[PDB]
Design a protein around this ligand. Sequence first.
Ligand SMILES: CCC[C@]1(C)C(=O)Nc2ccccc2C(=O)N1C
Lengths: 116, 107
Amino acid sequence: GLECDGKVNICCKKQFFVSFKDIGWNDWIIAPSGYHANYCEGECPSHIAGTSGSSLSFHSTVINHYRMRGHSPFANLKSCCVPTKLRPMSMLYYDDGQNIIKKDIQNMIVEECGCS
Amino acid sequence: GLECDGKVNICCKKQFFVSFKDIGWNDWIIAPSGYHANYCEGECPSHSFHSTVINHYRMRGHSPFANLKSCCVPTKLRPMSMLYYDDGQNIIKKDIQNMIVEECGCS
Ligand SMILES: CCC[C@]1(C)C(=O)Nc2ccccc2C(=O)N1C
């Protein structure tokens, strides 16, 4: 997918540093104390609706078939810049199960952005 | 996730069948003749783990996320076995990724 830069106005990936102290989750999250989460932001015009950067999935090709023809609700449905690929991260935290847990938590880091 | 019915207003999975004959893709797609692609529709008010950290930041007055709207989008997609004609009229059997919307959620 696309990374944000000077003059990029459409859906792209940019930095987002999560500090667990800032949101008060450091009371039960031991490690890491903060990490590079990234986020998606930017315009999703019709010529890029449903894309994942330079790729268009089969599903998105069927939606665009209906969207292009003006079929409802697809025609009126707004396209949003959202993560399309996420990565896990090893975390050390206190669970409710009465212990300190080391676990790879899914969907922690944004790897790629795309339009819905 | 949540499935749509004419009752629930929030972000849900709307059932949607697509016939390849109806859209004229049957000249290259042999099988299946049709499938439930589905889609995501519905409101995403204040009430994945990445989305949760964004909302826990959006809740407080934090500049980028405070003006960043939550959208109803697929959270899980499933592949599907397809039989189709390729570039040189060869018949290919392949599991095509991201064919079916299985679950919807807010961004
Ligand atoms: C980023 C979430 C990670 C984790 C491990 C969780 O799975 N459960 C949660 C679910 C919702 C909110 C926080 C947490 C949480 O802080 N912990 C303990």
